[PDB]
Amino acid sequence: YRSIDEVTAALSHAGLESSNLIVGIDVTKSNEWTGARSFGRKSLHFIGTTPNPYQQAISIIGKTLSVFDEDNLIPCYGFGDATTHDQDVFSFNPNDTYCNGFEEVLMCYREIVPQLRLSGPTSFAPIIERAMTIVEESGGQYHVLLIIADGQVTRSVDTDNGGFSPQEQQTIDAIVRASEYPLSIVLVGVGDGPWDTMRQFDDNIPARAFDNFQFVNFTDIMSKNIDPARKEAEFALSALMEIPSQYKATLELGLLGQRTGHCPDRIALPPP
Ligand SMILES: [Cl-]
Ligand SMILES: [Cl-]
Description:
It is found in: Cell membrane. The protein is α/β, with parallel strands linked by helices. It has helices spanning 4-13, 53-65, 102-112, 125-137, 166-178, 198-203, 218-222, 228-240, 243-252; strands spanning 20-26, 73-74, 76-79, 90-91, 99-100, 143-149, 183-189, 213-217.
């Protein structure tokens, strides 16, 4: 595809209908040094004259999915700063409401991220649980959760014997539980990684009723010697190509428009 507008149209042609977006942003400490190779030794959260990988990924996916979003409300959260660690998420909206469109998401991000104290450890369980709660509150409307992160979930420091860390186990569990909801999870890897362990994380996830999880390496696509519009389109397509199939599975499995009655009831903290 030549542009993300063509990708948008292709997703519609493949059967995507009303679709909602939730954004989760990794604000752990390693963002300060994982742009060594891929972002000119700047922090991946550096706010400067050109967009950082978080801003770019949000812009591209936000634009691609915008026409499917009826209410244009985009819940947006951070995780891994000093206020949340691996236990919570915080809202990027400072007015106790949801952002109106991806452009406002980007404004909130720019406003808040220089005020954060980047921390750890890294877990995706809180953001996935918040997404489940949002889906349940919506009465089972279809959602895409976009997680943007610069590292896999925190590993055990016992590199000889230590199996799954609490972060790994809780994140895997959340992915499994999430598959009871009409929810697609897209993990976008930014920065240097490494990202060559994702295929094994995928094997470590128990079988689910539908494949609700996908990973895309943003850095590997966006570094290519390719026309920028085409490159952005390649990223959008690589991130979202399974979404129409997953949406169909939520129909087949009787998830769309249905409530479980037992969601995490996870509440976000306000922004620092
Ligand atoms: Cl709220
Ligand atoms: Cl909220």
